[PDB]
Nucleic acid binder design. Structure first.
Ligand SMILES: [Mg+2]
Ligand SMILES: [Mg+2]
Ligand SMILES: [Mg+2]
Ligand SMILES: [Mg+2]
Ligand SMILES: [Mg+2]
Ligand SMILES: [Mg+2]
Ligand SMILES: [Mg+2]
Ligand SMILES: [Mg+2]
Ligand SMILES: [Mg+2]
Ligand SMILES: [Mg+2]
Ligand SMILES: [Mg+2]
Ligand SMILES: [Mg+2]
Ligand SMILES: [Mg+2]
Lengths: 145, 78, 141, 143, 55, 58, 117, 106
RNA sequence: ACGGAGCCAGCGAGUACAACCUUGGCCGAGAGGUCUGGGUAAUCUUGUGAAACUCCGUCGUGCUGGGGAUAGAGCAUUGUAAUUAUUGCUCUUCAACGAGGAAUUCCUAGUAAGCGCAAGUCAUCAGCUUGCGUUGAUUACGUCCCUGCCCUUUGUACACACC
């Protein structure tokens, strides 16, 4: 039934991977705020972590929070396949990984400078900062700065 | 764009003991209470509003008359 | 053998054929009880013939209906026509024509399409647009 | 008196039969459950964490009971609605075939469905009796 | 025109793989039922073929 | 051969168009007027309506 | 870290069997090599092997002009000096270790980028 | 000696109707003349062929679209008849145009 | 909106001197693969079990689970050839967008609109077009006010004709 919900324990501010997460949102749809963590991946990591999907992110204790942040840092060990990974097969080492909030941003930037250093058509277009997937640019965007 | 919305939080999604008592007291004296009628009085966010509504349908505090999805009609019991 | 007749109703494409016999009051559309027509909205509409006649006026008459074509609610209106036409056909072939007159009077006093088929039908679409009587748009510049 | 599956509403019967399969420890659950969205067109995995597979299996059981026989591709075309193709107009996308194949294999293991001569899987005597039993149970639950 | 070079590109499929059987024009062909005629020589010879204005 | 009957009739129409266009192309000097095709159970007769019958026969 | 492509360093990639990299080399390369590719890359490969052999071990190999923009860099090509056909000039690409996987066309810009204003 | 029954079938196709009807009626009448049993000249749904073309040959102007169609009919007929009688019947009186096919269906 | 549960259509089209429609069964989460079967067609695809919609649940006003463009990483199929990303799938990133100025477009009943389906373009692709069906309305049922059209009368210094 309904719960009085642990008078004085409804936390509002959480710091997961230096992300200022709020608590009143649903757990999966609050963790989706963290970069590299989408709705689907957060939903799966919540299902594997045996915590209620309908349970809110404001009143969990720290043990579960740390258990999931462990789960979503080495996913493949926990019956998460190669897919569901932020950087599949990871073209640096061949070891499929799942980059996270700041790691995703840093590695995306590093890939951008790699594409510059290689001086590839895709990389040179990134240097310009234009359409790269080859679409028609007669009217695409027409305003970026 | 402009800071014209000025919309506050305006909702507490999960009840406390105080709001529990207010809900269980003001449950009668209202001929009609819905999900959004319950939201109107600022006492719940709204996702838990229907939770509280069905949880007031445990000892027949409020009788239901129509039980359609997204719209159930609840009238105080006497 | 048992007095039995066969009718049908239509809505835009939808065809509901009904076989009606002298039985013990069976209303089975697609081998299903009438209380269980899916839409959940126009359910009372299939009740419409029945409830204008009054179930007490037919209890040893049974009806089984096979239907196809059209949409859901078009299918429901085909059900309406099929049941009404079957009942009136049974009355006028076996009981009496005063009964047929009184049933037609009771029916036609409400939703005239109860016994008559909806005669107005979709028309072909044409070029120069995306509708049968619609044009794309004009620019001038 | 006599009762059949067609004589009870689809939704209440289907939920009740899914719960009935929930009670029995039968109907083996494949490994890749809890992970799959049952179709590419869907955006997020089923809200029902556990028991949704039993719901689909029950739906397969009733859906085979209605007609003569069906196949996994047929259910794939039926299962799954429209895919929000980003900006593109919503089309019809076939559901995941693996989930339906495993559902039908598990239903064969339960003996509620077997291989039909025409090609596909048709209802079984034991299976149709079980469906009649659960339909009677649901009908008596209603009244 | 070493035979291995000239005309070596395959035309199994695509626009240029089919001719009009009337003028050989690749543009605007009617491939339905293997008419293999373009739109307009077809509208010329269709009343002779058997197509007709009905609606 | 194994051809769809609808496609068989379409091919017959194309055949008729070819024959008529051909007979127009040559027999103008002999006054071509029309061509007819009768696919008989055994043979496939072709009739020529022409002005200069002496010339078309040769 | 010096450079790692897919876990194999430049030390092994420099002397690396091509097919053992075909087990690597994401889906498109695998499909290409599963269908087979053609004799023309074989000729190009032989020409570059000869050119690399004949280079005097301290100067970069001679420029080999090449029209095949549909080509992917094989591991056994690093350091080659190939002019890919931009249309007018076989604009130069010297085969860096990261060339592998990417196509030749990814470095020959067929259009000169536009300048407005 | 082919007196035994063969369950023969006659398929028909015609871009027109009048000659097809005449052929079917003639076949039925000949069968009655030799007094054979049959399934009636069951009609087949009008196989209508429609293809649309841009009526302009170049592509300018108000968008005009034209539709060219045929309508073919099959009308298959099965005969529980012996061999040579039905062969003689189906090899006589075939007016031009109407394509006829014969199958033993053995 | 998203999850589940129901489960209704029609026009089409479809392999031969070449390789289509694809059933059904094994696989893979998927796209997709494989084994076999029918169908030259009211037979088989297919009753194209189509969406929109119907019921029950989660979300509850916050650029929010709306919105999915823009970016990376992989896996697939077509193609001799996918790089300037062919296309589909997996994951993540999440833009602008608060029902939009002057103006302007289409429409009177199965009609507008919403929703799809099939066919044409086809190796592979649609945001397109052509046909089809589905949920199926508001508002007239009239007038020259605007834009024109028709017939008559009248005037003109116009006739390559009020540009
Ligand atoms: Mg241009
Ligand atoms: Mg429309
Ligand atoms: Mg559907
Ligand atoms: Mg669905
Ligand atoms: Mg829905
Ligand atoms: Mg939408
Ligand atoms: Mg969404
Ligand atoms: Mg149909
Ligand atoms: Mg957002
Ligand atoms: Mg829409
Ligand atoms: Mg076009
Ligand atoms: Mg003058
Ligand atoms: Mg002037």
């Amino acid at each position: 039934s309904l719960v009085v919900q642990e008078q004085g324990s409804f936390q509002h501010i959480l710091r997961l991977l230096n992300t200022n997460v709020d608590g009143n949102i649903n757990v999966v749809y609050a963790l989706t705020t963290i970069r590299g963590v989408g709705r689907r991946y957060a939903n799966l990591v919540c299902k594997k972590a045996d915590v209620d999907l309908h349970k809110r992110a404001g009143e969990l204790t720290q043990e579960e929070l740390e258990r999931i942040v462990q789960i979503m840092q080495n996913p493949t060990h926990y019956k998460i396949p190669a897919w569901f990974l932020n950087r599949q097969k990871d073209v640096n080492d061949g070891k499929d990984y799942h980059s996270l909030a700041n790691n995703l941003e840093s590695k995306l930037r590093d890939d951008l400078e790699r594409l510059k250093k290689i001086r590839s058509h895709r990389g040179i277009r990134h240097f310009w900062g234009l359409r790269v997937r080859g679409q028609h640019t007669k009217t695409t965007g027409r305003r970026r700065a | 764009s402009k800071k014209s919305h000025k919309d506050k939080a305006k909702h507490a999604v999960v009840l406390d003991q105080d709001k529990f008592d207010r809900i269980m007291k003001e449950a009668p004296t209202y001929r009609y209470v819905s999900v959004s009628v319950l939201v109107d009085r600022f006492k719940l966010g709204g996702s838990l509003a229907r939770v509280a509504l069905r949880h007031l349908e445990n000892e027949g505090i409020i009788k239901p008359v129509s039980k359609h999805s997204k719209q159930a009609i609840y009238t105080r019991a006497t | 053998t048992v007095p039995s007749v066969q009718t049908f109703g239509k809505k835009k494409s939808a065809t509901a054929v009904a076989h009606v016999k002298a039985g013990k009051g069976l209303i089975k559309v697609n081998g299903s009880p009438i209380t269980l027509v899916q839409p959940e909205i126009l359910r009372f509409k299939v009740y419409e013939p029945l409830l204008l006649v009054g179930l007490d006026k037919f209890a040893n008459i049974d009806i089984r209906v096979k239907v196809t074509g059209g949409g859901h609610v078009s299918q429901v209106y085909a059900i309406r026509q099929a049941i009404a036409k079957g009942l009136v056909a049974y009355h006028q072939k076996f009981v009496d024509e005063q009964s047929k007159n009184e049933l037609k009077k009771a029916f036609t006093s409400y939703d005239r399409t109860l016994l008559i088929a909806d005669s107005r039908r979709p028309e072909p679409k044409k070029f120069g647009g995306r509708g049968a009587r619609s044009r794309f748009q004009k620019s001038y510049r | 008196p006599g009762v059949s599956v067609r004589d009870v509403p689809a939704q209440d019967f289907i939920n009740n039969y899914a719960s009935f399969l929930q009670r029995q420890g039968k109907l083996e659950v494949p490994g890749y459950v809890d992970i799959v969205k049952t179709s590419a067109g869907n955006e997020l995995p089923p809200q029902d964490s556990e028991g949704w597979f039993y719901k689909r299996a029950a739906s397969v059981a009733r859906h085979i009971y209605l007609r003569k026989q069906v196949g996994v591709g047929k259910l794939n075309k039926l299962y799954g609605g429209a895919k929000n193709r980003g900006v593109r107009p919503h089309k019809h996308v076939d559901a995941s075939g693996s989930i339906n194949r495993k559902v039908l294999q598990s239903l064969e293991k339960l003996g509620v469905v077997e291989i039909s001569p025409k090609g596909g899987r048709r209802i079984s005597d034991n299976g149709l009796r079980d469906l009649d039993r659960i339909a009677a149970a649901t009908l008596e639950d209603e009244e | 025109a070493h035979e291995n070079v000239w005309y070596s590109h395959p035309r199994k499929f695509g626009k240029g793989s089919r001719q009009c059987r009337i003028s050989g024009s690749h543009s605007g062909l009617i491939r339905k039922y293997g008419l293999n005629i373009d739109r307009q020589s077809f509208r010329e010879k269709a009343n002779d073929i058997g197509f007709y204005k009905y609606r | 051969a194994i051809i769809s009957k609808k496609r068989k009739l379409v091919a017959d129409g194309v055949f008729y168009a070819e024959l008529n266009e051909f007979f127009t192309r040559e027999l103008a000097e002999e006054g071509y007027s029309g061509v007819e095709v009768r696919v008989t159970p055994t043979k496939t007769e072709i009739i020529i309506r022409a002005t200069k019958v002496q010339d078309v026969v040769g | 870290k010096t450079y790692s492509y897919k876990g194999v360093d430049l030390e092994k990639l420099l002397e690396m069997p091509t097919e053992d990299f075909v087990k690597l080399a994401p889906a498109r390369v695998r499909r290409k090599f599963a269908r087979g590719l053609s004799e023309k890359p074989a000729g190009l490969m032989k020409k570059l092997r000869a050119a690399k052999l004949s280079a005097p071990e301290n100067e970069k190999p001679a420029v080999v002009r090449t029209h095949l923009r549909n080509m992917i860099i094989v591991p056994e090509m690093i350091g080659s000096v190939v002019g890919v056909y931009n249309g007018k000039v076989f604009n130069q690409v010297e085969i860096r270790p990261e060339m592998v996987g990417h196509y030749l066309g990814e470095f020959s810009i067929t259009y000169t980028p536009v300048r407005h204003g | 000696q082919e007196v035994v029954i063969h369950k023969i079938r006659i398929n028909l196709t015609s871009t027109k109707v009048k000659q097809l009807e005449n052929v079917s009626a003639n076949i039925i009448k000949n069968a009655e003349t030799f007094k054979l049993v049959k399934k009636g000249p069951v009609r087949l749904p009008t196989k209508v062929l429609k293809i649309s073309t841009r009526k302009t040959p170049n592509g300018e102007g108000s968008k005009t679209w034209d539709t060219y169609e045929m309508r073919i009919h099959k009308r298959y007929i099965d005969l529980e008849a012996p061999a040579h009688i039905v062969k003689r019947i189906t090899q006589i009186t075939i007016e031009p145009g109407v394509d006829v096919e014969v199958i033993i269906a053995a």
